[PDB]
Amino acid sequence: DDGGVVNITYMHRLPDSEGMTLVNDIVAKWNKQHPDIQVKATKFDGKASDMIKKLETDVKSGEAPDLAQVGYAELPEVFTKGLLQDVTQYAEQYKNDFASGPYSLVQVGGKAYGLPQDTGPLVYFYNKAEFEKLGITEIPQTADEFIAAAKTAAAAGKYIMSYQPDEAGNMISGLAGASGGWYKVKGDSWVVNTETDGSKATADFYQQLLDAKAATTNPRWDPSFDASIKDGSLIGTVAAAWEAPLFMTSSGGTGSGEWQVAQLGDWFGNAGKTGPDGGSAVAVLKNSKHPKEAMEFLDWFNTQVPDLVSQGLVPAATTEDAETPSEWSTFFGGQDIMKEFKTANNNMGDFTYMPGFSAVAAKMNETAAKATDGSGKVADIFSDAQTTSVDTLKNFGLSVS
């Protein structure tokens, strides 16, 4: 048996903003109950996409945590990098606490490497009051009707879409991928096609919007993006479900009581589906001496549903229903937005990510930014992702067909 006190470390990249139940306050409740398994939780300091680069560094270094947030999209990459610990015999014990889709996303080759934490379906945030003022009385459901509506808004200095070039790798892959995967293993080789009917429909949608100066072009994480909400010019956008509290904070309160959540319209060749943008597991890393207790604490942490929901998470936990925080329904015109998130989750397409997808995402972000001044075409995002996808797999020494 272990010594009397086991010490577990947990690196996460949850927001911990004002009004949320802090990860350290969640963890402190566990620590008080479990003198036998003490947990130290720290928040990664840097850009989200860089966290797994730091994990890679610290695994090699022997400074790595026992547990670390790893996106579903990142898990095949960090697996291939040798950063994870097979914890199948532990995960099996907690499987029934989690929805089965997300659980399957902590697996590589029928071995499990952690537990799922949340999901990222894409939805549509809009200010219904401001849509009314422009005579937009229904969310238009075809790309053509939407683009027409967006041109009307733009003429009044309003925008019912954002183009977020710093997020193309996560959001635009999600949108295109709603209608079909880009990556599949066929026997001995990967088959890559990032230029699906979805990818084409997606490009055409944002291309028309950009050409019409009918979508904002501020990078999502820049002060200018927040400025566009505060000032009231951005009145609609695609967002990942986990953006709800971030968006609310970014608004400074502007439009409070008028905002609404809808399902994505049929704007991206998506045919009634949505797609994933982010969503994460927590993985047990290669050199953790205490996989059992790490997973025991994790199962408890990932089932603290209201606390997780305060972080904007749409939990993978099925142990109790997630509920809309009173602050959020107030902001969102009295709406039970959590119902919309679950509807979106249940209509979300599966999407396999190749190992090395981080390079695909980073390229997509680069090619996306070129379209803002019209020197690149939006379509280029996907032709480039094709070539970067193929080259990254070959660089990993993997076979591409």
Ligand X SMILES: CC(=O)N[C@@H]1[C@@H](O[C@@H]2O[C@H](CO)[C@H](O)[C@H](O)[C@H]2O)[C@H](O)[C@@H](CO)O[C@H]1O
Smallest gap from Cβ 49 to ligand X, in A, equals 6
Q: Alpha-carbon distance 215 to 158, whole Å?
A: 9
Q: Which does 48 bind (CB under 5 to 8 A by kind): ligand X, Zn ion, none?
A: ligand X
Q: Alpha-carbon distance 122 to 143, whole Å?
A: 16
Q: Is 15 in the site for ligand X (CB under 6 A)?
A: yes
323 is in an annotated binding site: yes
Q: Which of 2, 92, 144, 321 touches Zn ion (CB under 5 A)?
A: 2
Site track for ligand X across 161-180, x = CB under 6 A: ---------x----------
Nearer to ligand X by Cβ, of 48 and 227: the residue is 48
Q: Is 71 in the site for ligand X (CB under 6 A)?
A: yes
Smallest gap from Cβ 189 to ligand X, in A, equals 27
Stretch that binds Zn ion, among 30-38, 163-171, 253-261, 342-350 (CB under 5 A): 30-38
Residues 214-233 binding Zn ion (CB under 5 A) are: none
Nearer to ligand X by Cβ, of 71 and 356: the residue is 71
Q: Is 118 in the site for ligand X (CB under 6 A)?
A: yes
Residues 312-341 binding ligand X (CB under 6 A) are: 312
With CB under 6 A, what is the number of residues at the site for ligand X? 14
Smallest gap from Cβ 349 to ligand X, in A, equals 16
Nearer to Zn ion by Cβ, of 62 and 157: the residue is 62
Distance of CA 84 to the CA centre of its chain: 21
Q: Is 357 in the site for ligand X (CB under 6 A)?
A: no
Q: Is 344 in the site for ligand X (CB under 6 A)?
A: no
Site track for ligand X across 275-294, x = CB under 6 A: ---xxx--------------
Q: Which does 15 bind (CB under 5 to 8 A by kind): Zn ion, ligand X, none?
A: ligand X
Q: Quick one: which of 367, 197, 167, 348 has its CA closest to 268?
A: 197
Q: Is 120 in the site for ligand X (CB under 6 A)?
A: yes
Q: Which two tokens stand for residue 320?
A: 């109790």
Q: Which of 16, 17, 21, 34 touches Zn ion (CB under 5 A)?
A: 34
The 10 Å CB-count burial string (b at 16+, else e) for 360-390 is bbebbbbbbbbbbeeebbbbbbbebbbebbb
Q: Is 151 in the site for Zn ion (CB under 5 A)?
A: no
Residues 248-307 binding Zn ion (CB under 5 A) are: 290, 293
Q: Quick one: which of 286, 254, 293 has its CA closest to 56?
A: 286
Stretch that binds Zn ion, among 2-10, 14-22, 241-249, 271-279 (CB under 5 A): 2-10
Q: Alpha-carbon distance 330 to 251, whole Å?
A: 14
| HEC readout, the chain | CCCCCEEEEEEECCCCCCCCCCHHHHHHHHHHHCCCEEEEEEECCCCHHHHHHHHHHHHHHCCCCCEEEEECCCHHHHHHCCCECCCHHHHHHHHHHECHHHHHCCEECCEECEEECECCEEEEEEEHHHHHHCCCCCCCCEHHHHHHHHHHHHHCCCECCECCHHHHHHHHHHHHHCCCCCEEEECCEEEECCCCHHHHHHHHHHHHHHHCCCCECCCCCCHHHHHHHHCCCECEEEEEHHHHHHHHHHCCCCCCCCEEEEECCECCCCCCCECECCCEEEEEECCCCCHHHHHHHHHHHHCCHHHHHHCCCCECECCCCCCCCHHHHHHCCCCCHHHHHHHHHHCECCCCCCCCHHHHHHHHHHHHHCCCCCCCCCCHHHHHHHHHHHHHHHHCCCCEC
Q: Is 242 in the site for ligand X (CB under 6 A)?
A: yes
Smallest gap from Cβ 114 to ligand X, in A, equals 13
Site track for ligand X across 211-240, x = CB under 6 A: ----------x-------------------
Q: Which does 36 bind (CB under 5 to 8 A by kind): ligand X, Zn ion, none?
A: Zn ion
36 is in an annotated binding site: yes
Nearer to Zn ion by Cβ, of 200 and 290: the residue is 290
Annotated binding site: 2, 34, 36, 290, 293, 321, 323
Annotated binding site for Zn(2+): 2, 34, 36, 290, 293, 321, 323
> Could you list the residues that contact Zn ion (CB under 5 A)?
2, 34, 36, 290, 293
> Could you list the residues that contact ligand X (CB under 6 A)?
14-15, 48-49, 71, 118, 120, 170, 221, 242, 278-280, 312
